[PDB]
Design an enzyme around this catalytic site. Structure first.
Site, PDB file in Angstrom:
ATOM      1  N   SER A   1       2.155  -3.023   3.307  1.00 23.83           N
ATOM      2  CA  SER A   1       2.524  -4.409   3.471  1.00 23.83           C
ATOM      3  C   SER A   1       2.001  -5.269   2.321  1.00 23.83           C
ATOM      4  O   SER A   1       1.012  -4.912   1.690  1.00 23.83           O
ATOM      5  CB  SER A   1       1.940  -4.935   4.798  1.00 23.83           C
ATOM      6  OG  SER A   1       2.532  -4.273   5.910  1.00 23.83           O
TER       7      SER A   1
ATOM      8  N   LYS B   1       2.946   6.640   6.118  1.00 24.73           N
ATOM      9  CA  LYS B   1       2.158   5.627   5.447  1.00 24.73           C
ATOM     10  C   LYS B   1       2.825   4.277   5.648  1.00 24.73           C
ATOM     11  O   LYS B   1       4.032   4.149   5.498  1.00 24.73           O
ATOM     12  CB  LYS B   1       2.016   5.953   3.950  1.00 24.73           C
ATOM     13  CG  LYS B   1       1.077   5.058   3.157  1.00 24.73           C
ATOM     14  CD  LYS B   1      -0.367   5.230   3.554  1.00 24.73           C
ATOM     15  CE  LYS B   1      -1.275   4.260   2.844  1.00 24.73           C
ATOM     16  NZ  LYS B   1      -1.330   2.929   3.486  1.00 24.73           N
TER      17      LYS B   1
ATOM     18  N   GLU C   1      -1.106  10.231   5.750  1.00 27.93           N
ATOM     19  CA  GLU C   1      -1.842  10.407   7.001  1.00 27.93           C
ATOM     20  C   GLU C   1      -0.916  11.160   7.918  1.00 27.93           C
ATOM     21  O   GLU C   1       0.292  10.895   7.938  1.00 27.93           O
ATOM     22  CB  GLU C   1      -2.246   9.049   7.592  1.00 27.93           C
ATOM     23  CG  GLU C   1      -3.033   8.161   6.648  1.00 27.93           C
ATOM     24  CD  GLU C   1      -3.026   6.680   6.975  1.00 27.93           C
ATOM     25  OE1 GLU C   1      -2.475   6.261   8.025  1.00 27.93           O
ATOM     26  OE2 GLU C   1      -3.544   5.909   6.144  1.00 27.93           O
TER      27      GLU C   1
ATOM     28  N   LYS D   1       0.156   3.366  -2.952  1.00 28.41           N
ATOM     29  CA  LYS D   1      -0.926   4.339  -2.952  1.00 28.41           C
ATOM     30  C   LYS D   1      -0.448   5.800  -2.987  1.00 28.41           C
ATOM     31  O   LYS D   1      -1.130   6.655  -3.529  1.00 28.41           O
ATOM     32  CB  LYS D   1      -1.865   4.113  -1.757  1.00 28.41           C
ATOM     33  CG  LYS D   1      -2.615   2.798  -1.795  1.00 28.41           C
ATOM     34  CD  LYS D   1      -3.613   2.663  -0.665  1.00 28.41           C
ATOM     35  CE  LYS D   1      -4.453   1.403  -0.739  1.00 28.41           C
ATOM     36  NZ  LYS D   1      -3.759   0.162  -0.300  1.00 28.41           N
TER      37      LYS D   1
ATOM     38  N   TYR E   1     -10.616   2.732   5.157  1.00 28.79           N
ATOM     39  CA  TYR E   1      -9.423   2.470   4.344  1.00 28.79           C
ATOM     40  C   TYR E   1      -9.757   1.479   3.216  1.00 28.79           C
ATOM     41  O   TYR E   1     -10.310   0.418   3.496  1.00 28.79           O
ATOM     42  CB  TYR E   1      -8.301   1.926   5.223  1.00 28.79           C
ATOM     43  CG  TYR E   1      -6.984   1.757   4.498  1.00 28.79           C
ATOM     44  CD1 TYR E   1      -6.169   2.853   4.228  1.00 28.79           C
ATOM     45  CD2 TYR E   1      -6.565   0.516   4.083  1.00 28.79           C
ATOM     46  CE1 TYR E   1      -4.970   2.708   3.560  1.00 28.79           C
ATOM     47  CE2 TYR E   1      -5.362   0.340   3.429  1.00 28.79           C
ATOM     48  CZ  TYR E   1      -4.572   1.451   3.161  1.00 28.79           C
ATOM     49  OH  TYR E   1      -3.407   1.280   2.516  1.00 28.79           O
TER      50      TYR E   1
ATOM     51  N   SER F   1       0.782  -1.231   0.000  1.00 35.09           N
ATOM     52  CA  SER F   1       0.000   0.000   0.000  1.00 35.09           C
ATOM     53  C   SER F   1       0.827   1.303   0.000  1.00 35.09           C
ATOM     54  O   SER F   1       0.275   2.371  -0.213  1.00 35.09           O
ATOM     55  CB  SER F   1      -0.975  -0.001   1.155  1.00 35.09           C
ATOM     56  OG  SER F   1      -1.948  -0.992   0.932  1.00 35.09           O
TER      57      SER F   1
END
Ligand SMILES: [Ca+2]
Ligand SMILES: [Ca+2]
Ligand SMILES: [Ca+2]
Ligand SMILES: [Ca+2]
Ligand SMILES: [Cs+]
Length: 360
Positions: free
Chosen positions: A312, A309, A266, A61, A144, A58
Site C-alpha cells: 500500500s 504480499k 509470506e 519489496k 516487518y 511494499s
C-alpha cells in the site's frame, strides 16, 4: 469465462470500498487475463487501461528480494554473511551480526518499521545504522521493516557494483519484460499515472523519501507484475540464473506462527482459512514483534501453499496471491488504500470461484 467469475466480485468490491479504479491480472497455465475497471483518476474520469501506472508500495519489496536473490545466485552476495562485509562503512556496528537473509525475512534484531525523521539522505542513514542497537534477538523475532529491506537493497547494490535502480532495471525488470515498471515516472508517462485516493476520499500521490526505491517506490501495471508472477509459477521462459533467483525467493526461512516467512514473500500451507490470511495482514503480525523460528533445513519452494504480499501507499492498495500447485496467480491493484481484509476476501472469492481452492 474467467471474466464471468471475476467481474461481479470486482464490481462489488469497488462499490463496497469506493475504489475509483482497479487493474487485475489473473495468471494461469493457458495464459494471462488482464482486466481494467473504472477510473485511473476520480476527478478527471480518465479510464484505467493497459498503460495505467499504479503505486504498488511494499509490493516493491518482492523485486528487491528478487534482485538480492540474483546477486546470490551469481555468487556476488552471501545471504548468511554479515551485512558489513558488503558495506564496510557499517563495520563494527550491529550489522556485523545481521545477515542479508535476516533483512529479507525481517529478522534483523527488531530493525524498526519506518525510516526515522532524522534520516534525510544516504549519509544520515548510514550514521543511523552504525549507531542503532538491536531490540530483539537476531534471527529469532520478526518485525516487518522498511529499514531492513531498504538495507538489503543497499547491500545488494554494493555486492553488484551498481546503483540500485539501473541494476534492478537491467538484471530483473528488462529480462522479465517489465517495461512499464518505474521508480520515477518519466514526464512522458505522467498522463498514465493513476491518482491515488486516501481513506477520506482525498487525492494523494506518494512523495519521494529515503529508501523509497528499495522499500516502496515502484509504479507499474498489473500486466508487468503478472510477469514476475508468471516466472514464479514456472510459466515464463527466462534466463536459468534468473529463474533460480526467483525460485529461491519462495524458500521458507522462518516459521512465524501459522505464517512461513520466505524472502519477502509470506506463505501459508493449504488448505488455509481466510481468517488465518487476515491475521497475517493485521496489527498483531505487521505492527508487533513476532517470535520466529529458523528453518535451516532451508525449506525448498513448496507447491501446496498460498503465497502472498500486500502493498500500500496512502492512496493505493495492491495484493498478489500465488498458488504454485495450481500454477495460478492473482494481481490486484487499486488506486485506493482499502482494508487488507477486503483484499484477502476478494482474492479468496476469486480463486475459489475459479476452482483454484475450496472453501470448507
Ligand atoms: Ca554462507
Ligand atoms: Ca517520517
Ligand atoms: Ca531514491
Ligand atoms: Ca464478507
Ligand atoms: Cs521502463
Amino acid at each position: 469465462q474467467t471474466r464471468e467469475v471475476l467481474d461481479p466480485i470486482v464490481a462489488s468490491l469497488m462499490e463496497a470500498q469506493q475504489i475509483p479504479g482497479m487493474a487485475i491480472a489473473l495468471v494461469r497455465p493457458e495464459g494471462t487475463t488482464i482486466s481494467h475497471y473504472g477510473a485511473a483518476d476520480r476527478e478527471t474520469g480518465t479510464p484505467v487501461d493497459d498503460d495505467t501506472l499504479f503505486e504498488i508500495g511494499s509490493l516493491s519489496k518482492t523485486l528487491t528480494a528478487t534482485l538480492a536473490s540474483l546477486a546470490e545466485v551469481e555468487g556476488k552476495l552471501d545471504f548468511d554473511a554479515p551485512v558489513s562485509r558488503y558495506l564496510p562503512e557499517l563495520e563494527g556496528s550491529a550489522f556485523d551480526d545481521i545477515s542479508g537473509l535476516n533483512l529479507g525475512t525481517h529478522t534483523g534484531g527488531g530493525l524498526p518499521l519506518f525510516v526515522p525523521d532524522e534520516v534525510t539522505d544516504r549519509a544520515s542513514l548510514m550514521a543511523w545504522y552504525r549507531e542503532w542497537q538491536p531490540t530483539e534477538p537476531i534471527g529469532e523475532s520478526r518485525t516487518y521493516s522498511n529499514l531492513g529491506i531498504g538495507l538489503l537493497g543497499l547491500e545488494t547494490a554494493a555486492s553488484l557494483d551498481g546503483e540500485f535502480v539501473p541494476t534492478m532495471r537491467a538484471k530483473v525488470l528488462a529480462p522479465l519484460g517489465m517495461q512499464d515498471t518505474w521508480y520515477d515516472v518519466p514526464e512522458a508517462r505522467m498522463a498514465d499515472y493513476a491518482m491515488g485516493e486516501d481513506k477520506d476520499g482525498q487525492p494523494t500521490r506518494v512523495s519521494p523519501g529515503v529508501l523509497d526505491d528499495e522499500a516502496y517506490g515502484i509504479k507499474t501495471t498489473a500486466a508487468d507484475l503478472a510477469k514476475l508472477v508468471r516466472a514464479n509459477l514456472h510459466l515464463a521462459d527466462v534466463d536459468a540464473e534468473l529463474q533460480q533467483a526467483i525460485d529461491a525467493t519462495r524458500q521458507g526461512h522462518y516459521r512465524v506462527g501459522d505464517m512461513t516467512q520466505a524472502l519477502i514473500w509470506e506463505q501459508y500451507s493449504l488448505p488455509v482459512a481466510p481468517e488465518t490470511l487476515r491475521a497475517g495482514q493485521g496489527y498483531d503480525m505487521i505492527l508487533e514483534p513476532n517470535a520466529a523460528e529458523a528453518l535451516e533445513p532451508p525449506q525448498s519452494p513448496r507447491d501446496d501453499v498460498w503465497v502472498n504480499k500486500t502493498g500500500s501507499t496512502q492512496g493505493f492498495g495492491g495484493y498478489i496471491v500465488m498458488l504454485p500447485g495450481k500454477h495460478t496467480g492473482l494481481v490486484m491493484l487499486a488506486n485506493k488504500n482499502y482494508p487488507n481484509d477486503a483484499r484477502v476476501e476478494a482474492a479468496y472469492r476469486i480463486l475459489s470461484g475459479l476452482g483454484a481452492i475450496d472453501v470448507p
